[PDB]
């Protein structure tokens, strides 16, 4: 009985920003989702099409876990169908989703006394994100008719703003580490059972 690695995607020392989230393919496991559901440390455990008590009695083919760090007030936008600055431009979930969104407070780790400017998010885009698509393109969007050659004074605005993370912000503006488990069932032998 070899259990599945959840101990490097949950309690990791440093996650990634929301505009470049970490996608980790999990396969050939025996997972234990009941240890996750009865941990009493997460603040948001919402499953969106499966039952959380019947997670162990399911055989999938791949499980994909997406880790990122957002504000506490923006964990609502990791729902199927919701909109906002995060669901439109950073991380879009489709409205046929089958997975469980997990989140917990992380003010002790992702906040420094001067401000942690390591967590970025995308401010605008050309069009909305079709679901499960990342876009890491640091281009200055060229508003106006003159090629500005890599400046930020007038138009030619930068597309990525940094999160302002202090330890005195508010329980909705503290950094909430979010991991999104997504279950996929292809036409293949099922190996992730539990």
């Amino acid at each position: 009985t070899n259990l599945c690695p959840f101990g490097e995607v949950f309690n990791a020392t440093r996650f990634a920003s929301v505009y470049a989230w970490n996608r980790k393919r999990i396969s050939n496991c025996v997972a234990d989702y009941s240890v996750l559901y009865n941990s009493a440390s997460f603040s948001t455990f919402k499953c969106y099409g499966v039952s959380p008590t019947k997670l162990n009695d399911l055989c999938f083919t791949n499980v994909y876990a997406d880790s990122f760090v957002i504000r506490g007030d923006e964990v609502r936008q990791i729902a199927p169908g919701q909109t906002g600055k995060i669901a439109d431009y950073n991380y879009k979930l489709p409205d046929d989703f089958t997975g469980c969104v997990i989140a917990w407070n992380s003010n002790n780790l992702d906040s420094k006394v001067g401000g942690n400017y390591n967590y970025l998010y995308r401010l605008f885009r050309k069009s909305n994100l079709k679901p499960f698509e990342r876009d890491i393109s640091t281009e200055i969007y060229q508003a106006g008719s003159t090629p500005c050659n890599g400046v930020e004074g007038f138009n030619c605005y930068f597309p990525l703003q940094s999160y302002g993370f202090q330890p005195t912000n508010g329980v909705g503006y503290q950094p909430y580490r979010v991991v999104v488990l997504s279950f996929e069932l292809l036409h293949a032998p099922a190996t992730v059972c539990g």
Partner: antibody
Amino acid sequence: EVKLEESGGGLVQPGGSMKLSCAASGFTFSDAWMDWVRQSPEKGLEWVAQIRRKANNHATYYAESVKGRFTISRDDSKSSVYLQMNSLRAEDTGIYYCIRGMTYAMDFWGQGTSVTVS
Amino acid sequence: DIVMTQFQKFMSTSVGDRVSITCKASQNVRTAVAWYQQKPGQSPKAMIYLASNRHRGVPDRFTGSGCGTDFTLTISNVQCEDLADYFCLQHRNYPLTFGGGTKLEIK
């Protein structure tokens, strides 16, 4: 609190000179692109000049109606921008507003300063 | 220079209606149009930047959309707070020209 206040409220004979000053505080004055816009009762809103931020070589862009009669100069150490006007005319009448940064966020405007000619 | 034509100088709508102010242009300014509200006796406060985004502290009623040449700023549930002038300007090329202005008065 972000605030911008102007000076130089008076009347001049056509042929004098008047140097308006816009003192700003409450934000980082190094990276801000500050224009000067004009409101006259006959011609509506107009646009006079523009000084840019420090990383763009302190560029100056004037409208083509005020070339050679209008210079703009900023100083980030005293946190103020100046609009020096020389050889004025009859259609330079109006109110001159000093703004923080136009056409993006932090789009604050001043309060203005009445400039008239006789 | 790029000129903004704003042919409605007087719009007469009652309380709680929907008004749509248009700002025609003469050449294809892409998305670079800002909208300004000037209450009588003050300086213009910014409403819309880059023709679709909304500022901080402005209500949800103030929305503007459109690209190309013919832009619009549509307000809904017109209160008594919105008795002012509405200007539009383009900022693609450096002769930045404002609009004419659209004054609202309550019926």
